[PDB]
Design an enzyme around this catalytic site. Structure first.
Site, mmCIF file in Angstrom:
data_model
loop_
_atom_site.group_PDB
_atom_site.id
_atom_site.type_symbol
_atom_site.label_atom_id
_atom_site.label_comp_id
_atom_site.label_asym_id
_atom_site.label_seq_id
_atom_site.Cartn_x
_atom_site.Cartn_y
_atom_site.Cartn_z
ATOM 1 N N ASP A 58 12.343 49.887 46.126
ATOM 2 C CA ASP A 58 13.605 49.485 46.488
ATOM 3 C C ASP A 58 13.741 50.921 46.417
ATOM 4 O O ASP A 58 14.461 51.565 44.688
ATOM 5 C CB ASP A 58 13.901 48.277 46.075
ATOM 6 C CG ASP A 58 15.248 48.303 45.550
ATOM 7 O OD1 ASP A 58 16.427 48.754 46.707
ATOM 8 O OD2 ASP A 58 15.482 47.833 44.164
ATOM 9 N N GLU B 60 26.545 53.542 47.834
ATOM 10 C CA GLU B 60 28.158 53.356 47.900
ATOM 11 C C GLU B 60 28.613 51.674 48.792
ATOM 12 O O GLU B 60 27.267 52.456 49.625
ATOM 13 C CB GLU B 60 29.074 54.582 48.476
ATOM 14 C CG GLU B 60 27.982 55.326 49.613
ATOM 15 C CD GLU B 60 29.394 55.376 50.738
ATOM 16 O OE1 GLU B 60 29.347 54.181 50.425
ATOM 17 O OE2 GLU B 60 29.208 56.235 51.776
ATOM 18 N N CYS C 262 22.398 48.570 49.886
ATOM 19 C CA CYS C 262 20.119 47.890 49.552
ATOM 20 C C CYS C 262 19.929 47.813 51.409
ATOM 21 O O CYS C 262 18.619 48.394 51.411
ATOM 22 C CB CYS C 262 20.116 46.762 48.812
ATOM 23 S SG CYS C 262 21.288 45.457 49.314
ATOM 24 N N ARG D 43 26.321 62.380 56.670
ATOM 25 C CA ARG D 43 26.309 61.724 55.700
ATOM 26 C C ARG D 43 26.900 61.194 53.683
ATOM 27 O O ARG D 43 27.641 61.354 53.009
ATOM 28 C CB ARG D 43 26.487 63.638 54.933
ATOM 29 C CG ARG D 43 25.310 64.852 55.554
ATOM 30 C CD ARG D 43 25.923 66.210 55.785
ATOM 31 N NE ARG D 43 27.663 66.631 56.050
ATOM 32 C CZ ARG D 43 28.626 66.678 54.966
ATOM 33 N NH1 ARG D 43 28.557 66.190 53.172
ATOM 34 N NH2 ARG D 43 29.853 67.220 55.858
ATOM 35 N N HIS E 238 20.002 41.018 48.085
ATOM 36 C CA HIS E 238 19.332 41.993 48.050
ATOM 37 C C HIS E 238 18.121 41.806 49.195
ATOM 38 O O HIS E 238 18.021 40.882 49.669
ATOM 39 C CB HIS E 238 18.887 42.086 46.713
ATOM 40 C CG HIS E 238 18.197 43.886 46.575
ATOM 41 N ND1 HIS E 238 18.406 44.724 46.679
ATOM 42 C CD2 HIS E 238 17.512 43.981 45.457
ATOM 43 C CE1 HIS E 238 18.220 46.097 46.240
ATOM 44 N NE2 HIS E 238 16.924 45.768 45.469
#
Length: 272
Positions: A124, A36, A67, A62, A107
């Protein structure tokens, strides 16, 4: 903090640095902690990639993350368990044709080794939408079937490209160098992707998770559930439904982001 994380991902098994444990950790992580971007969406950069900050957010609070947060956190965990971890940088090319502009190098993925490994593995858990839910052999040519899609690495330039067969077409996901990058370079990348006005993680909502052999992918108000048998698409009716979905289906503590009305208003503006 190793136990807090293991409880967060509902992991039960051994903790020796082996291939079986790596598989089981990657599967547990990807089933438990959503992808998210609610922080960047709400104007909160992702700047602090320390173990403590990432654990506080992705474990104690939580929340999910993107990435740098995912591969940040699992990287710290794996190193604590005795794996050797090298952090790598890559460029996202998903759905792009071969003549597309060079993407930013925003990334990050891991090269992982351990006692008795036949070679390094790519880990990943942070590539939302299509993240491999198994460690992959860092080797070219081999078709590597996971619990979901098959993946394949190939040589490209002075680096590699990870591909997956999505539905019925092999799609390049990202290209990466196998050179270790310093933490500061990852911070620079995360700053860009969490604050640049052109970043897809600033301009829209993205969430992803895996449940019951299915990918649950959310782009704005557009929910897609990619099952073995096919894909179900759902248009969420309003910002409230999007927030409910983030909490209920993606397991995100949306209350952490602040006043629900402020989150809804941003989602309304951006997604509707």
């Amino acid at each position: 903090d190793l136990t807090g994380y293991l409880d967060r991902i509902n992991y039960r098994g051994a903790t020796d640095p082996t291939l079986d444990v790596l598989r089981d950790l990657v599967s547990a992580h990807t089933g438990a902690i959503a992808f998210e971007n609610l922080d960047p969406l709400m104007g909160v950069p992702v700047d602090d990639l320390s173990a403590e900050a990432l654990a506080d957010k992705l474990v104690d609070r939580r929340r999910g993350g993107y990435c740098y947060e995912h591969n940040g956190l699992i990287g710290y965990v794996l190193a604590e368990l005795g794996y050797r971890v090298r952090r790598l940088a890559g460029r996202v090319v998903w759905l792009a044709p071969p003549d597309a502009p060079t993407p930013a190098q925003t990334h990050t993925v891991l090269a992982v080794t351990f006692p008795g490994c036949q070679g390094p593995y790519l880990v990943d858990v942070g590539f939302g939408g299509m993240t491999p839910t198994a460690p992959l052999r860092l080797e070219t040519g081999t078709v590597q079937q996971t619990a979901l899609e098959p993946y394949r690495l190939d040589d490209r330039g002075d680096g590699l490209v990870l591909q997956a067969m999505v539905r019925d077409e092999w799609q390049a996901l990202y290209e990466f160098s196998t050179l270790t990058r310093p933490q500061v370079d990852l911070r620079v990348g995360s700053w860009f992707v969490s604050t640049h006005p052109t970043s897809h993680f600033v301009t829209g909502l993205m969430a992803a998770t895996v449940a019951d052999d299915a990918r649950w992918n959310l782009m704005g108000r557009n929910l897609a559930i990619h099952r073995r048998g096919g894909t179900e698409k759902i248009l969420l009716e309003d910002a409230a439904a999007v927030v409910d979905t983030l909490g209920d289906r993606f397991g995100i503590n949306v209350a952490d982001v602040g006043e629900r009305g402020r989150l809804e208003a941003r989602i309304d503006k951006v997604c509707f």
